[PDB]
Design a protein around this ligand. Structure first.
Ligand SMILES: N#Cc1cnn2c3cc(nc12)N1C[C@H](C[C@H]1CO)OC/C=C\COc1cc(cc2c1NC(=O)CC2)N3
Length: 331
């Protein structure tokens, strides 16, 4: 007997009810533009599959971000391009302004909306309880939207959240790991970064869904309210589950393994041990307590669950008392 199947609790068949061209990204014909419309000003960084620059679109003299792509599978590029196009205009989703190719090099580049970002290291330390609540709701707008559009981000982490604090403008970026949700589909578990990987990825449970992003949101929330980045600091993918098990406990972990008939890797047998579920109060101290409240702890507990099906959806999370003052101010 193999693993018990799983279906998303929400937006299950959204992609089945859409035209084939919506999710059939392999068939997408890419709309190239003029590489000479943009002039590179300076380097902003280097990704695994890209070189990032600040550019100026000369035709309308406006600041853009150019991601010059390193070789990666054409269908992976078609996937990111299709996802970005389906999500265009969505709340707090980065805008893909253009797709350009160097005439001589033949190397592709993606042009994005520029976000004058305040580095998450210097910013998070200055953030008030209201600021955390406000920006958490903004990420949730982006996740409810993309989930409702049949897409899982699969890489929610502080690096992929661009904030221009001065203009209170948040954008969920880097959709290169995103995928279309299809009921019954077994996905690649070697996605997301270590500290944000859901238990399903760590136990090698492939039939996952949008709820994976809700775990990553939980890890972000715990790091912000506890001033502990990263919250779950694993040495590898195996020790990462041990770090989670020391907090959430081993009983709920083995209950989850049993429920979905997961074949647990032999490595885990001698390292998971036996651990009680810890109360969130043990992470509370004098320099973080002004960010922690009963509403924050209730919310965080409802996101950080082993069983992906028992986690809050982005819509349920937006309806939690933690955001009552944020919701009130928006009206
Ligand atoms: N899509 C998109 C997108 C939109 N804005 N934006 C910015 C950078 C960026 N991508 C975007 N990068 C840079 C690099 C790779 C890529 C992220 O995969 O990661 C390094 C981390 C960010 C450094 O922080 C900045 C990010 C941006 C602009 C500035 C700073 N830092 C300043 O001191 C003022 C100017 N905008």
């Amino acid at each position: 007997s193999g693993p018990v199947p799983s279906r998303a609790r929400v937006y299950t068949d959204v992609n089945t009810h859409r035209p084939r061209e919506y999710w059939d990204y392999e068939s997408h014909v890419v709309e190239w533009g003029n590489q000479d419309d943009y002039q590179l000003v300076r380097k902003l960084g280097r990704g695994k599959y890209s070189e990032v620059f600040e550019a100026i679109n000369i035709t309308n003299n406006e600041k853009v971000v150019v991601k010059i792509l390193k070789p990666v599978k054409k269908k992976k590029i078609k996937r990111e391009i299709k996802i970005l196009e389906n999500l265009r205009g969505g709340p707090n989703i980065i805008t893909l302004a253009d797709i350009v190719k160097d005439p001589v090099s033949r190397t592709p580049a993606l042009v994005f909306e520029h976000v004058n970002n305040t580095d998450f290291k210097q910013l998070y330390q200055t953030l008030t309880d209201y600021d955390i609540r406000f920006y958490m709701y903004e990420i949730l707008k982006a996740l409810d939207y993309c989930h409702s559009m049949g897409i899982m981000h699969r890489d929610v982490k502080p690096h992929n959240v661009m904030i221009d604090h001065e203009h209170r403008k948040l954008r969920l970026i880097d959709w290169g790991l995103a995928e279309f949700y299809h009921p019954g589909q077994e996905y690649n578990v070697r996605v997301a970064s270590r500290y944000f990987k859901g238990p399903e990825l760590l136990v090698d449970y492939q039939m996952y869904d949008y709820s994976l992003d809700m775990w990553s949101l939980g890890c972000m929330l715990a790091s912000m309210i506890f001033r502990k980045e990263p919250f779950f600091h694993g040495h590898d993918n195996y020790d990462q589950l041990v770090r989670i098990a020391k907090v959430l406990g081993t009983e709920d972990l083995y209950d989850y393994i049993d429920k979905y008939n997961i074949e647990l890797d032999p490595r885990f047998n001698d390292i998971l041990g036996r651990h009680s579920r810890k109360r969130w109060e043990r992470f509370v101290h004098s320099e973080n307590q002004h960010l922690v409240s009963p509403e924050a702890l209730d919310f965080l507990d409802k996101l950080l669950r082993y069983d992906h099906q028992s986690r809050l959806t982005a819509r349920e999370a937006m309806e939690h008392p933690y955001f009552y003052t944020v919701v009130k101010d928006q009206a």
